[PDB]
């Protein structure tokens, strides 16, 4: 699960 900005 990639961070919001990645």
């Amino acid at each position: 699960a990639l961070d919001k900005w990645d």
Epitope: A1, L2, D3, K4, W5, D6
Partner: antibody, heavy 132, light 108 residues
């Protein structure tokens, strides 16, 4: 100047529901890409990430606590609420809420995402003891 | 999930020393890593964001470098207020993990 402060009950009994409120000033949860997260710290232990919510209302939770956490925001009151259900003694900890910057913008155009990589301002923290 | 291991877990030092704390991630986190210093009884305080950027108002003796899976925080000249516990935090993958912390105490 950004400041945050946690409030809620200092004592809670097992199986009960814990509602923690983060009231802040200096930014709005309607500002672009801003986030407010919650982190806890059992006495003598390491920091543990719990959840975060952004101004566009995306929410994310620790997978280990997902079923017991609800995070919500009240933009007009400048508050973020975290509700934890079915607490048990291991949930005794100091709970902190914190600000997360959104990308820097230039004439309302996102140009730098490096500032989102940190929780930059923290509240003093609220000690919560869980015991019957 | 993703693991963040700090080293050393504990470290002794004296005022004026140069110390360096390191944090290793189990999978690459690009540059999305932050360092904090937490003094007893207080909340953590942001020192370095995005692996190497100096947070505003933070003293220049603090420095951060690295990207991918290996990062380091170095305090070039330890001051009394630096006797504390330091933490690194990854923000590339959810959940946004914290390392185990490294305690820096007075050497004797």
């Amino acid at each position: 100047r950004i400041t945050l402060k946690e409030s809620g009950p200092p004592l809670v009994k097992p199986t009960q529901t814990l509602t923690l409120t983060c009231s802040f000033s200096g930014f709005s949860l309607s500002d672009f890409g801003v986030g407010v997260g919650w982190i806890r710290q059992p006495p003598g232990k390491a920091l543990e990430w719990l959840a975060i919510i952004y101004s566009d209302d995306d929410k994310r939770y620790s997978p280990s606590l997902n079923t017991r956490l609800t995070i919500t925001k009240d933009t007009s009151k400048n508050q973020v609420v975290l509700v934890m259900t079915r607490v048990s003694p291991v949930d005794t900890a100091t709970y902190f809420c914190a600000h997360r910057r959104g990308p820097t913008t230039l004439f309302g155009v996102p140009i730098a995402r490096g500032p989102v990589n940190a929780m930059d301002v923290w509240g003093q923290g609220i000690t919560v003891t869980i015991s019957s | 999930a993703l693991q963040l291991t700090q080293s050393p877990s504990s470290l002794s030092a004296s005022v004026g020393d140069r110390i360096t704390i390191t944090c290793r991630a189990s999978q690459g986190v690009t540059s999305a890593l932050a360092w904090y210093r937490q003094k007893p009884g207080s909340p953590p305080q942001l020192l370095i964001y995005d692996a190497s950027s100096l947070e505003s108002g933070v003293p220049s003796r603090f420095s951060g470098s690295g990207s991918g899976t290996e990062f380091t925080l170095t305090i070039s000249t330890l001051r009394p207020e630096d006797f504390a516990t330091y933490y690194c935090q990854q923000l590339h993958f959810y959940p946004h993990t914290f390392g185990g912390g490294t305690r820096v105490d007075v050497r004797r």
